Symmetry: C3
Subunit: 596 residues, 3 copies
């Protein structure tokens, strides 16, 4: 009896009944202990003696044994205990070896991480993916991971190690072909990695989420090629209420917080600091296997960000046999700024970027039905390379309503680069243009329409303060065709501007172009006393359907017309009034209108 009690079966001989309730099960102590499981239950030597974790102990095989065993019973939750740091010091074996995997996750086996998991210097200068849900080296031949949740107040610490070579990959959690998996509460910190977490594989997976996690200092070297902290590669998945921070200079040039790469995905309520980019929203044709060729129902909302490059990047692309499409996107409620930096010191600052594909092509994209509403954006006055939208590839539609943009440019694309074909660009008059960059815009167009063509578009410019430094509010080079569009410049704060809207190819004459903008015009009258015509001296107004005075009349003896129409020779003409006769000559600020 004493022998049995002291044996490993001893708890199985000590009886227990819950709270002494006579109606409860007559169990043994070991049965109640068997209701929970921890790493300590597997962290032992071959004789079964517990081993203390630490920097000289490789915990990997013990944690794998625990996972494998719980998997064999239909699942459960393994605790990684608080008050200890559990080091990982070798690669895993089998199916995860193809992925540089350390631990293999298994279906229905959750990890409650309350302590700390650290990488040992075995991993210095090497690739690694700490937790891998694939079960095969070839993701296409992998089985699924289902019902796997990682959660707790604990920490995954990547040991500070730099990348050995840029071509290496490093990840925290790769769930694989992942269905109903999640990470909640965990701090990922102190690394040089490619991703912290990836969800799904090329569209295979569903209902994967990252919630209330922190990602701190996960890029630290010039070797690191690229970084996205969470990559969402399965539908019906997303990221909420997370915290992302970087301190490295390299992070400002390479790091993005989130990638949304399949339909019905979201990124919400998160705070970002120190990153180059906020989120990619992309349909890569190469990733369309599991959920189709369309990324739709994409949501970026209610985030807070200080970044150095672009907040949201939109794109789609093609392969030999598949074409990717991006539509039905909403970007709303986000408050974003470009952090303090020199002009041109990081990738071009933007709220929205329409980005060319990885080979630089701007003629592959199929992006449409995007709504950008109720956001704020700010860039400091010195940051020349700051835009509401950098529109650098073909765009099939994007709608801006009720945003507040306070940066150098509203719409921009660099000249002599890409020549996007633009359709359905809608800039509603309810977009408020801030004044931080007033006086900085010498030689620049606020809306610099450096496109191949623009159709079915609306640009309603409304200033909120003066900026007489700018060359124009909106300019179309002669190379940009413009048709079936509405372009207006409100007169407020424009009285002193030489140029308001500029059409370098006279494109505002087009049959289905609807415009209005202010201009100064010299007129001369006939000598007749009484009702008397005034005519413009210049003949460049053949396209004008009406014009009206924006100037007061300082004269007593006459008045110019209040409103004008045109004549076939391109003159404006209106009927004013000479109280006394005489030829009159005036210069008047007019609102020129065409079909509006």
């Amino acid at each position: 009896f004493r022998a049995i009690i002291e044996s490993p079966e001893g708890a199985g001989h000590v009886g227990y009944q819950y709270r002494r309730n006579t109606g409860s099960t007559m169990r043994m102590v070991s049965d109640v202990l068997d209701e929970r499981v921890s790493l300590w239950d597997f962290h032992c030597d071959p004789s079964g003696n517990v081993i203390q974790p630490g920097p000289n102990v490789d915990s990997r095989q013990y944690l794998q044994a625990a996972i494998d065993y719980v998997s064999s019973n239909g699942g459960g939750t393994i605790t990684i205990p608080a008050g200890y740091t559990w080091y990982l010091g070798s690669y895993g074996v089998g199916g995860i070896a193809g992925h540089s995997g350390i631990i293999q996750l298994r279906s229905n086996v959750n990890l409650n991480i309350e302590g700390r998991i650290h990488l040992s210097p075995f991993f210095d200068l090497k690739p690694f993916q700490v937790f891998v849900g694939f079960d095969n080296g070839d993701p296409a031949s992998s089985g699924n991971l289902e019902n796997c949740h990682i959660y707790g107040h604990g920490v995954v610490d990547f040991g500070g190690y730099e990348f050995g070579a840029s071509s290496q990959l490093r990840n925290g959690v790769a769930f694989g072909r992942s269905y109903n998996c999640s990470v909640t509460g965990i701090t990922f910190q102190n690394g040089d990695v490619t991703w912290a977490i990836t969800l799904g594989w090329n569209g295979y997976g569903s209902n994967c989420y990252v919630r209330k996690c922190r990602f701190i200092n996960l890029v630290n070297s010039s070797v690191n090629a690229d970084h996205s902290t969470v990559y969402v590669n399965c539908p019906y998945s997303g990221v909420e209420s997370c915290y992302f921070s970087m301190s490295s200079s390299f992070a400002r040039n390479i790091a993005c917080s989130v990638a949304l790469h399949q339909h019905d995905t979201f990124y919400r309520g998160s705070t970002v600091n120190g990153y180059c980019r906020g989120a990619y929203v992309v349909m890569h044709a190469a990733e369309a296997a599991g959920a189709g060729s369309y990324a739709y129902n994409m949501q970026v909302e209610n985030n807070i960000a200080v970044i150095y490059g672009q907040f949201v990047i939109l794109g789609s692309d093609v392969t030999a046999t598949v074409s990717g499409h991006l539509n039905d996107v909403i970007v709303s409620g986000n408050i974003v700024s470009i952090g303090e930096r020199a002009a041109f010191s990081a990738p071009f600052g933007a709220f929205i970027d329409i980005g060319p594909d990885n080979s630089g092509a701007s003629n592959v994209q199929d992006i449409q039905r995007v709504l950008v509403t109720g956001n704020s954006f700010y860039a400091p006055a010195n940051i020349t390379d700051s835009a509401a939208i950098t529109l650098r590839a073909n765009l099939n539609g994007c709608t801006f309503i009720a945003n507040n943009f306070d940066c150098r440019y509203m719409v921009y694309n660099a000249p002599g680069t890409t020549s996007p074909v633009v359709q359905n660009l809608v800039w509603d008059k309810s977009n408020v243009i801030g004044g931080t960059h007033a006086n900085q815009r010498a030689g620049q167009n606020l809306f610099d329409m450096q496109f191949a063509s623009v159709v079915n578009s609306t640009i309603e410019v409304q200033l909120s303060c003066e900026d007489l430094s700018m060359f124009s509010c909106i300019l179309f080079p002669a190379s940009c065709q413009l048709s079936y569009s509405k372009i207006t410049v409100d007169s407020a704060w424009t009285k002193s501007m030489s140029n308001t809207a500029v059409f370098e190819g006279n494109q505002q004459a087009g049959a289905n172009v609807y415009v209005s903008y202010p201009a100064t015009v010299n007129l001369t009258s006939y000598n007749t006393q009484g009702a008397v015509p005034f005519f413009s001296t210049d003949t460049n107004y053949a396209w004008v359907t009406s014009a009206y005075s924006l100037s007061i009349n300082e004269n007593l003896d006459f008045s110019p017309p209040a409103t004008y129409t045109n004549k076939a020779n391109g003159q404006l003409v209106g009927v004013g009034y000479n109280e006394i006769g005489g030829v009159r000559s005036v210069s008047v600020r007019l609102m020129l209108q065409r079909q509006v």
Copy 2:
């Protein structure tokens, strides 16, 4: 001693002190084991021998015994263990019997569901409510349920069984008259049910929530009368970050994700696919007992949906002695689409529906102070039955600002059906109208104002592309009175339209009607050289206060007036200029204006 140790009291004789700390309590093993409780502690036969769960074991009585016992100690949390499926195979007894109840919930007793709960085929073709918080067959005589939380990574599986008769009811969790209750993390799946979860009873309850749950395939037959996945029937309660999916055809015609039926309730951050409807926001007079006759502070925000019918349905109604009112509603940040379907194959597609009561009455409602802002809506081009708002019952106010609507109709109601009385309908010019349905609108009015009357309303139409197929942008039949309203049609993309705004009863003449829209007008001048009047040939412009040219003047020898007023006989009149004399005859596109 050996006897005591092996007895059910044995753990109560084995001493323990936490971590060997001399300052800690000298306890017994059983005391520490008694800190937790699971189903295994009650899942035993009359001799106390544990019973293994499975498809041939009815776990109901054991789970009820556990709940009842924990309730007797002031509460706690019962775990339903992982790695097992726990079948339910009989009805409960007592107070829950009136509700077809299986398990009775009790105050302060939480369920941590980590394993799976399944319904056995005893329930096939029968009604059932799996977990019931009422304690009486008659909800009016029921006590409350307080401080009851269901949570975990587990699953409630309804066994796939179809309904036996349409009149039956089936539910997952009915919390009853429920205060500070919640469901978090749970997957509900594989059923034909009426609701998954209901919160509160006829306004009695408070602080009930459904968070991070999944609802998958909960309608599967033509027998199922109706389905709402979560019904919120108590104030200060709501649904967040949930996932709802249906695959059944029947679901597309009957199923709604959420019902918000009392004040201060919300539905946020959720994803919906495969449902007919997104949310009801309703004050039923029949449900006003617990929290009053007003549903106010209703919030639907930041959701993602693919549906087949209507996204948000607003309503209120009356009984013999109570009148229900709906006000102070916000619908914002939602991105919604009508899924691919044939026209008229499901209930009429809409972003907002103002729905008549369950008896079809449209003259009972009191709905006002609703704000619909910053949403996107899309329906495929073939779906004739798609509208921003189907306004089918009396409306006392609804405000649209800064939405993007891309569907067949903006405002619609079917002719010869209901004749709503409409007040305070506000459609701000910042609503962007998409072009998906361009060329599909032969015989149709974009805003089809099929109402009894419209007052204190604003419709500011702004197109973003051409659609010459449409009969008109906005039309008022002669039966619709119109007063104290503003109706404008911006000219952009309208030059080629025969009809822009149409007032079949000439209602735009009303004293307090403020309108503007484009029209073509034939004018003739007098022969006089010099300043010369032009007059419209038609006499239907008695209501016009000013008009201005939207056309260029192709002539050299004359110009028509830039602006016009009217005359008592209904002609327009303006002063142009004949450089040379002669009678002139022109056809000009004008912007007609009345009091604007």
Copy 3:
């Protein structure tokens, strides 16, 4: 052996191996029991006998012993068991004594509160802070608190006791200089306190959050000086999905739900009832030590509130050596109402308040780059003291887009009080003004511009119904300078108004003022048959650049001009048409325009 087994070391002699797995660690029962810890492990007398909690037992020393011990092992989670109420009955000692502290929190030691914690009447009429994370009486000399989480379904009950003196302070949780700390799930109730929770200290701290908590009835007496339920005094921190309720009359005059006082903080998805105020968003110079002098990236979104005073209060202030700045703020998606109350019975009702500092100064503030978008606000028709914005101190910018405001005033400041200097106030035309207060505005200006000066501002007034009671839509007293601004009043619903915009100092004449508004004007013509001038009888239109008719012409024999310009003497002049000669005299409603 029997002796050892019955001793406190007995569990340490009973062997256990998890699930009888031969590959698992050979442990002892005590090792598995040592994986968890509860208050029962420390709630014992000097002989180690467990003590039952209750109203006559002071649990404080036991809970402190537990915290101190777990702290010594590197942390963990202490459970406060369900089914018991644990009373606190004395003050703590040492470093927390300076803060009236009860319990001292320690780093890495979490509290899972499942039971109830109550204050004993020892605390009646006394100050207290229940849980304190400072370790020194002087916060400046305090160490940090890190990785401390309080969570569970339990309750902190403040015993109902009133404050003894107004100068006293009372708090639930003061995390101190707090990094990665949180409270989740907890109900705070039944008190008279200053705060429930405070996060950070004068900018020191990071990543602190309050989530899914309830705060119920935490002000109950006239002694209570002031109350903010959560004070956020560290960056990268915030409040989400919480519930706040008060029933006291005193709460309506003193209580605020949240204070956001450092950068990158948020308040989201919460419901508030019974409070005076929603949130302060403030940079106090006195609090700038830890995180700088700027509060930026401040987010208030998607909340539901019934309040009696002001929803969001903005401010910044200075000390002898530091100046505070507030910028980059977003207020969005909130649905707010002033509860039913008499006019002037609580602090002045407002959606936004620009508040003077604690000494009443209005010339210290530096508030700019604020976006207020997509919110709804309502106040009942009797509440004279209700405004979209009470602008009572210097403002450097605030932007309103696409809100729905339904209250007495849009912009207000009391005359003869403060004279704010206002820059960059932007009120977009997409703000919908509701009609609840129609007919109540005798003697009042809808936009009452009671400022020292206004510059670089935009006010675009758009009515949605008539209110002929109001004195004017917008009025500028002669003392308010106005320059480089745009002020427009849309004509809809204004035909019958005597005054629309009123410039008591004729400020609309300014060189860079852009205005338009309706006015009635008497004109007389010359007798000439044919094209004939009409001239205003009054000479106050020297500032007008154009005007156009808003009236029909009831005459056959003539027509007045459709459009007018001015003359140096301040007359308007236009060219109409006399079909038959004669002097004409008409009174016409015109749209007066200046530089627009």
